[PDB]
Amino acid sequence: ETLGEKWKKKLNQLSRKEFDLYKKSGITEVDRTEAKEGLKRGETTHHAVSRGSAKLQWFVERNMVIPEGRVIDLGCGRGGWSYYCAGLKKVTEVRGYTKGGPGHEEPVPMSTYGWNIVKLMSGKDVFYLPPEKCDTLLCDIGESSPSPTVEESRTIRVLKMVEPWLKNNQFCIKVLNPYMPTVIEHLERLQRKHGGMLVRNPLSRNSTHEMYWISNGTGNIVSSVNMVSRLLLNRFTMTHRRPTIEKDVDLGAGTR
Numbered sequence: 001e002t003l004g005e006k007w008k009k010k011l012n013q014l015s016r017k018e019f020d021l022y023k024k025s026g027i028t029e030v031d032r033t034e035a036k037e038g039l040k041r042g043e044t045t046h047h048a049v050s051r052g053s054a055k056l057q058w059f060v061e062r063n064m065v066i067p068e069g070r071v072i073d074l075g076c077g078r079g080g081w082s083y084y085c086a087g088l089k090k091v092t093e094v095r096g097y098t099k100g101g102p103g104h105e106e107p108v109p110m111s112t113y114g115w116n117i118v119k120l121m122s123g124k125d126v127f128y129l130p131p132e133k134c135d136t137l138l139c140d141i142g143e144s145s146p147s148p149t150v151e152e153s154r155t156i157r158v159l160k161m162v163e164p165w166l167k168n169n170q171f172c173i174k175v176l177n178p179y180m181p182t183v184i185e186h187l188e189r190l191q192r193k194h195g196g197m198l199v200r201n202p203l204s205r206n207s208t209h210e211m212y213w214i215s216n217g218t219g220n221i222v223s224s225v226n227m228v229s230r231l232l233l234n235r236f237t238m239t240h241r242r243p244t245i246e247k248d249v250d251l252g253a254g255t256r
């Protein structure tokens with residue numbers, strides 16, 4: 001019924017070859033060549049551990065979330081968001097939590113600028129964690145699934161989990177499937193209470209309808225979601241557009 005549901009049905013009809021040509025058509029991406037080569041060699045300075053550092057940097061450099069004080073990073077994985085925040089002037093502590101174990105990335109130890117204010121803790125399912133006081137709440141959880149009802153369930157669970165962590169603080173939260181009417185209802189209620197806006201990051205793949213609820217902005221959630229569904233549906237029409245290439249983020253070295 002929603003434009004997003006039509007997008008997901010069409011995405012599920014693609015062959016692997018078609019899917020591989022669609023997923024990056026017209027997106028933006030950072031060139032990870034140098035970082036991957038450095039990481040393979042065990043280099044611990046300058047490189048971002050994942051594409052996530054540039055993905056969060058995109059929101060921060062637009063002032064959509066402005067990390068400060070004690071940052072919590074839920075679903076930190078290898079730690080791209082955490083290591084990026086560790087170098088920001090207003091940040092004083094970064095605590096990352098992630099599941100780890102089979103099927104999940106482990107935190108990567110690094111020596112990028114501000115490493116000494118970061119603690120990444122694996123073996124932590126955030127759905128069992130009691131909330132902690134923080135000045136910035138980040139969450140990048142939401143596992144894609146071919147089933148949109150599984151994605152709807154996973155999105156609602158994240159939105160219910162994150163709310164007790166929100167106390168008039170800065171935030172950036174992934175919304176895996178933002179187009180279902182039940183999710184829209186939660187998002188509108190959450191925006192009435194905590195403010196912010198839902199934003200599509202250009203570095204996201206066309207194979208996910210993810211959007212991020214960020215704290216600094218206003219706007220109409222329904223309009224923003226439908227614009228993304230129409231964008232993703234239009235990207236099935238034409239031949240692959242190679243992604244727009246950008247430089248990856250240099251996270252430096254040193255303590256603070």
Ligand SMILES: Nc1cc(Cl)ccc1NC(=O)Nc1cccc(S(=O)(=O)Nc2ccc(C(=O)O)cc2)c1
Pocket residue numbers: 062200216217218227228231
């Ligand atoms: N065409 C289109 C298609 C889709 Cl499916 C979704 C969105 C758009 N359009 C844009 O995204 N337009 C836009 C224009 C100039 C700069 C940027 S920006 O993201 O670089 N910086 C911002 C953005 C918003 C605010 C705000 O509202 O406070 C603050 C800073 C975005």
Ligand SMILES: C[S@@+](CC[C@H](N)C(=O)[O-])C[C@H]1O[C@@H](n2cnc3c(N)ncnc32)[C@H](O)[C@@H]1O
Pocket residue numbers: 049050051052053074075076077078079080081082097098099100103104105124125126127140141142
């Ligand atoms: C891949 S990370 C996102 C990228 C990350 N922001 C970065 O920059 O590296 C998302 C993570 O959420 C983790 N995750 C999934 N379910 C989780 C849960 N219940 N509790 C904690 N972490 C979870 C996954 O293991 C995955 O590593």
